[PDB]
Design a protein around this ligand. Structure first.
Ligand SMILES: N=C1N[C@H]2[C@H](CS[C@H]2CCCCC(=O)O)N1
Ligand SMILES: N=C1N[C@H]2[C@H](CS[C@H]2CCCCC(=O)O)N1
Ligand SMILES: N=C1N[C@H]2[C@H](CS[C@H]2CCCCC(=O)O)N1
Ligand SMILES: N=C1N[C@H]2[C@H](CS[C@H]2CCCCC(=O)O)N1
Lengths: 123, 121, 123, 121
């Protein structure tokens, strides 16, 4: 459901995710991180399944944030891959990958992996 | 480096990805996979660092593909996170996460992880 | 601390992890999973940092379970990588990789990734 | 397949791993890395499927290395999860997780993920 996803969400670290789910399966919005070499809002773009299953299955989605805005550039990008689970307590459960640009030599230590859970607050 | 991300790339599995990199960090294009519950092209959208470091570092990027098009709906989405390295042989080294929408019961087994390397060859 | 780690632990899915931390950095014990093509106990082996930092840092560790015992064989193995955090509420926070043996053709869909949190019950 | 996992393997980064595979699924040996806060050999322990499927499937395995030896202590541990494929050119394809002990504050950035391919060459 696009409307289900559309809104303001927050995760356990205190980050803000403002997203709009478009009818063609598009996701656009802004991300505000509570951690890292990150200041202010960052543009996010993603995709979700706009025709999910009619049973109790989550809606698959994913989005990317490149950590560069007009104030900072961390030379890194995070992709979140997960599912939206609707109900009274709507959640987005994700696993993420954070890759930093590196020299060829340090490429083996370029990617962090973790997981985030988002709770919806507003539309 | 420079507009070099724009182009048609191919990975080890025969998948093709056509992308346009916008001056300000946007990535847009299509993806056509050769594996999984996939048939035809799919829209892709992502972001990349449009001001990378001057030292010899790669360009951080990432993109998403929801596997639903007019033909098929696999109820899943893959995100690729990596970095582009230009030169005589430009390549995009990535790690990816593929999440399938599941019931809560099967949520523990909802995400696959792998790696793909793309070249313009 | 070996004694801190040694004991009975359980995670959010209802699985049991019985482990002994040896003085040389070794971990041995048994795992009982509440999910998958898994029945009864399985042998686990792992390693942990037996000389961790004197500040509030967790203790790094990891272990493997090959899902084959005398009753079942799932042809798969899981490795858990994480940290032990001591206190009154001792936890082991992990991220895991589950690889299934596959044909070359299906190798791209051989590995699942997830995360588990363990709470200690007994010594 | 068979006792073929036993041996000395090498990965793309120059690391060497010497392993003995026990009849019942145990893996024991040493690892010597060429990258990170590492100096000399480290003990490794793991498990593998000692009764793999007869169809053309790989042998599931995994092992752990805590990065502490008599010389160095990096306060970290890496786990590799993958599968062995025998043949004219045997190889072990793996994905790994490297966790560093951190304060709670930095727990979000405690784990690196990558992939390594080992051959006997
Ligand atoms: N809300 C979250 N913040 C951290 C995790 C995943 S990405 C990350 C922020 C990184 C900030 C910029 C950086 O350090 O590169 N979730
Ligand atoms: N080129 C790639 N194709 C496979 C891997 C990761 S994404 C995947 C295709 C999956 C298609 C949809 C599905 O089976 O659910 N990389
Ligand atoms: N306690 C847990 N059980 C599942 C996760 C990670 S490994 C897994 C069990 C798999 C059981 C055997 C299998 O299906 O291959 N944690
Ligand atoms: N052969 C490999 N070496 C690096 C990757 C994953 S494990 C890593 C070595 C890390 C050494 C310890 C450290 O820096 O903390 N594979």
């Amino acid at each position: 459901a696009e409307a289900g996803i559309t809104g303001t969400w927050y995760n356990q670290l205190g980050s803000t995710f403002i997203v709009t789910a478009g009818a063609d399966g598009a996701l656009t919005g802004t991300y505000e991180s509570a951690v890292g070499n990150a200041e202010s809002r960052y543009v996010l773009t993603g995709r979700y399944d706009s025709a999910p299953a009619t049973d109790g299955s989550g809606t698959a989605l994913g989005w990317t944030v490149a950590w560069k805005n007009n104030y900072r550039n961390a030379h890194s990008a995070t992709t979140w891959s997960g599912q939206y689970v609707g109900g009274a307590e709507a959640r987005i459960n994700t696993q993420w990958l954070l890759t930093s640009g590196t020299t060829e030599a340090n490429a083996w230590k370029s990617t962090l992996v973790g997981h985030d859970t988002f709770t919806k607050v507003k539309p």
